[PDB]
Structures are given as C-alpha cells and as structure tokens.
Write an enzyme that holds these catalytic residues in place. Structure first.
Site, PDB file in Angstrom:
ATOM      1  N   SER A  18      16.274  17.571  25.011  1.00 43.79           N
ATOM      2  CA  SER A  18      16.299  18.823  25.802  1.00 43.79           C
ATOM      3  C   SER A  18      15.976  19.435  25.404  1.00 43.79           C
ATOM      4  CB  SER A  18      18.159  19.520  26.105  1.00 43.79           C
ATOM      5  OG  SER A  18      18.748  18.297  26.922  1.00 43.79           O
ATOM      6  N   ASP A  71      14.609  16.880  36.755  1.00 50.51           N
ATOM      7  CA  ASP A  71      15.704  17.478  35.680  1.00 50.51           C
ATOM      8  C   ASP A  71      17.188  17.797  35.988  1.00 50.51           C
ATOM      9  OD1 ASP A  71      15.299  16.685  32.252  1.00 50.51           O
ATOM     10  OD2 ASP A  71      16.774  18.767  33.774  1.00 50.51           O
ATOM     11  N   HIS A 101      19.995  13.962  32.970  1.00 51.59           N
ATOM     12  CA  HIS A 101      19.815  14.955  32.133  1.00 51.59           C
ATOM     13  C   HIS A 101      19.354  14.063  30.533  1.00 51.59           C
ATOM     14  CE1 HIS A 101      18.242  19.209  30.547  1.00 51.59           C
ATOM     15  NE2 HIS A 101      19.070  18.974  29.209  1.00 51.59           N
TER      16      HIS A 101
HETATM   17  O1  LIG Z   1      19.167  22.553  26.478  1.00 55.15           O
HETATM   18  C1  LIG Z   1      19.678  21.918  27.499  1.00 55.15           C
HETATM   19  O2  LIG Z   1      20.657  20.504  27.463  1.00 55.15           O
HETATM   20  C2  LIG Z   1      18.507  22.549  29.179  1.00 55.15           C
HETATM   21  C3  LIG Z   1      17.117  22.974  28.065  1.00 55.15           C
HETATM   22  C4  LIG Z   1      16.463  22.237  27.758  1.00 55.15           C
HETATM   23  C5  LIG Z   1      15.017  23.043  27.790  1.00 55.15           C
HETATM   24  C6  LIG Z   1      15.246  24.619  27.415  1.00 55.15           C
HETATM   25  C7  LIG Z   1      14.184  25.577  27.510  1.00 55.15           C
HETATM   26  C8  LIG Z   1      14.598  26.712  26.866  1.00 55.15           C
HETATM   27  C9  LIG Z   1      13.167  27.786  27.102  1.00 55.15           C
HETATM   28  C10 LIG Z   1      11.352  27.089  26.585  1.00 55.15           C
HETATM   29  C11 LIG Z   1      11.760  25.639  27.558  1.00 55.15           C
HETATM   30  C12 LIG Z   1      12.993  25.200  27.474  1.00 55.15           C
HETATM   31  C13 LIG Z   1      16.880  24.923  28.490  1.00 55.15           C
HETATM   32  C14 LIG Z   1      17.462  24.176  28.225  1.00 55.15           C
END
Ligand SMILES: O=C(O)Cc1ccc(-c2ccccc2)cc1
Ligand SMILES: *[C@@H]1O[C@H](CO)[C@@H](O)[C@H](O)[C@H]1NC(C)=O
Length: 340
Positions: free
Chosen positions: A145, A242, A286
């Site tokens: 993630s 996703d 996810h």
């Molecule tokens: O952390 C989580 O569970 C979902 C998640 C994953 C990546 C990003 C992300 C933020 C900035 C740039 C690209 C991706 C945000 C949320």
C-alpha cells in the site's frame, strides 16, 4: 516472532517525536535480508493529522508499540506459509510518519509533527549493518500500500547509501505491493499529495525529480511515471481493481459504471506492459504479500511465491518459470483464484 528495537539515534522520530524503530528476526545461516514497509494512507495538514492522531495513533507514535510481532506471509519463517524466502533475515518497519515514506523534516518550533519516513529507512539500514546486514548478498526492500509506493520512492536511495558506505557487493532490489496508482478521472467528483509534499518536505528519486522539476514532484508518487527512472530491479504486484484506487475514484451495475471499471482495468494493464517483473490479477482486493494465504492466488497457473522465485533465477527467459504475469480478462474476479 520479530523483536522490537527502537532506533539508537533518537533524533529519527515518528510523527509525535517518539523514536522510530524496526522488528527483527535474524537467520544466521542466510545472506538474504527482507525489509518490509508497512502501509496505511497519510495525512497532509494540521487538522487532518490531528484527527489521525486521535484514532490512528500507532501510525503516528511508538509509545504503544508491542515488544513483538508475528511474521506472516512473506515475513513467515515456515516453508509451508512462505515458499519463497522462509530462511531469510526478516525486518518489519512500522509506518509512523504519515508521509508515504517520503519526508525529511523534524518537529520544531514551526512544525507540530515530524515527517521523517525517508530518514527512517536510511537509519534502519545503518543500524542493521552492525547486526549482520554487512554480510548480505541481497537486500529486498518490500512494502504494501503506502509502503509499496515507499519502495518506489526509496529503493535507489538505499542502493546509493550502501555504495557510498563501501558495500558495493550487496544487491538492492524492490518489491512494490498495491502501491501502483493512476492519477485518473474520478467516477463522481493529486491535490492532497501536492500539499502533502510541501507539508512534509517530501523527497523523491533524483532522476524523476530532474524530469518533472520544481513544483511537479507529485508526479513521482505515481508508479508508471517513476518506475522508468529507477535503476534497481523492482518487482510490481498490483491488483487490477485495487480497493484504494476505487475509493479515491469514488466507486462503491449499469453501463456508465461498467464502462468506467472496465476502462480502469485496461489502463492499469497498459501501464504494466513493459514492466518485465510483475504480478497483476483481475481481482477487487487490497494488499497481499504479508497475508497468510498469499500463496493461494495464481495468474496463468503460476502463484506469486513462484513468480518471485523465478525473478530470483532471472537475476543470476526461463522455461516454465515466468516473471511477467498480468491478467487479460476485464472484470473483477474473472480470475477464479481471487481472494474470497
Ligand atoms: O495505505 C493504504 O492502505 C492505501 C494507499 C496506498 C498508497 C497511497 C498513495 C499515496 C500517494 C501516492 C500514491 C499512493 C495512498 C493510500
Ligand atoms: C542521527 O540522524 C540525523 C538525521 O538523519 C543525522 O543528522 C545525525 O547525524 C544522526 N546521528 C548520528 C550519530 O549518526
């Protein structure tokens, strides 16, 4: 069980000034090291970070961390749960900087919170070299993630850190799970990341920063833009549908939404066409790599642990041991092995 160590350099901190750290389980008969980056969204201003501090505090502070953590999935030491790297040295790095692992800013008179994700990774590597990492042959930087995006932002900096420290023989590689996003049109109506970078003093890989230049560094947070600039080998794991991508797109079936979802899968498949090491099933899900049942999903008859083992052999095309595995069917769960 992996055992907690708080960083000896107490100036490298979580959001609230408490020390950052890592959980470690050594394997004295192995020269492979797995460093895994936890995920969990982010926060981009004072008010939104205060909210997270109230009800997501373990993602902002080490004060309540447990002394141990059970290794699961790719962090498991049992061959049955982890056919890939069960004998490796295992490290779990908790995510407590809320900055997608990009920040380099201390708490101060002008900053209520510290955003030090990029410096946390560097300091963990430094302290580990005295616990065995100096003898490694492969360092795999993995993450799920927000930690998956963190792999893309930091894998080349770890490689450069070890070269400048006098360890040119350690091969640094990346494994990015569920961190490959599209800056697409929403279904119902990039700004948050742009504001985040300024709030965090965020840093991005150097070649990508030179392409997009001042004010446009947010672009390097998107896999299909930053990956071509990287020099280290990176294996990309990404569900085609996703759940966090759909959340940011405001998706929760008639023709309009059917066409939207089908176009999203097609666009993701297109961004992966020239990624030689990748695993991309047609599922609504996810994360995967630290899930206990991560061995269950298959693309074209090949599991993820097998694909990773084939990647290992390719870095020494192989008959019957593929490394590029992307589904072609166009709807979530058209692959029968998708998680229930
Ligand atoms: O952390 C989580 O569970 C979902 C998640 C994953 C990546 C990003 C992300 C933020 C900035 C740039 C690209 C991706 C945000 C949320
Ligand atoms: C502790 O970390 C900070 C921030 O990266 C660094 O400036 C400092 O030199 C480190 N201290 C030591 C003793 O390495």
């Amino acid at each position: 069980d992996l055992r907690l160590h708080l960083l000896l350099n107490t100036s490298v901190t979580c959001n609230d000034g408490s020390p950052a750290g890592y959980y470690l389980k050594e394997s004295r008969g192995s020269r492979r090291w797995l460093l895994f980056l936890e995920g969990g969204w982010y926060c981009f201003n004072r008010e939104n970070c205060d909210s997270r501090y109230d009800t997501m505090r373990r993602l902002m502070s080490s004060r309540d961390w447990p002394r141990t953590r059970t290794g699961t999935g790719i962090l498991s030491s049992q061959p049955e749960e982890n056919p890939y790297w069960w004998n490796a040295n295992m490290v779990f790095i908790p995510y407590c900087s809320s900055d997608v692992w990009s920040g380099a800013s201390s708490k101060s008179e002008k900053n209520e919170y510290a955003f030090m994700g990029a410096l946390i990774i560097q300091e963990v590597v430094r302290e580990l070299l005295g616990r065995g990492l100096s003898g490694a042959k492969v360092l795999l930087l993995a993450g799920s993630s927000a930690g998956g995006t963190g792999v893309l932002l930091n894998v080349d900096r770890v490689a450069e850190q070890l070269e400048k420290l006098g360890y040119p023989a350690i091969q640094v590689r990346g494994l990015a799970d569920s961190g490959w996003f599209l800056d697409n049109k929403q279904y119902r109506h990039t700004e948050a990341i742009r504001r985040g970078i300024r709030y965090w003093n965020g840093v991005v890989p150097e070649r990508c920063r030179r392409q997009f230049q001042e004010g446009e560094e947010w672009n390097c947070f998107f896999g299909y833009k930053v990956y071509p600039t990287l020099r280290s080998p990176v294996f990309v794991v990404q569900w085609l549908f996703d759940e966090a991508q759909l959340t940011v797109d405001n998706v929760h079936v008639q023709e309009g939404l059917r066409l939207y979802i089908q176009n999203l899968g097609r666009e993701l498949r297109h961004t992966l066409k020239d990624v030689p090491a990748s695993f991309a099933p047609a599922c609504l899900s996810h994360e995967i790599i630290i899930r206990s049942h991560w061995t269950d999903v298959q693309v074209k008859g090949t599991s993820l642990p097998r694909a990773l083992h084939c990647w290992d052999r390719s870095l020494h095309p192989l008959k019957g041991c593929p490394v590029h595995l992307v589904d072609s069917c166009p709807w979530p769960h058209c692959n029968p092995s998708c998680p229930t």
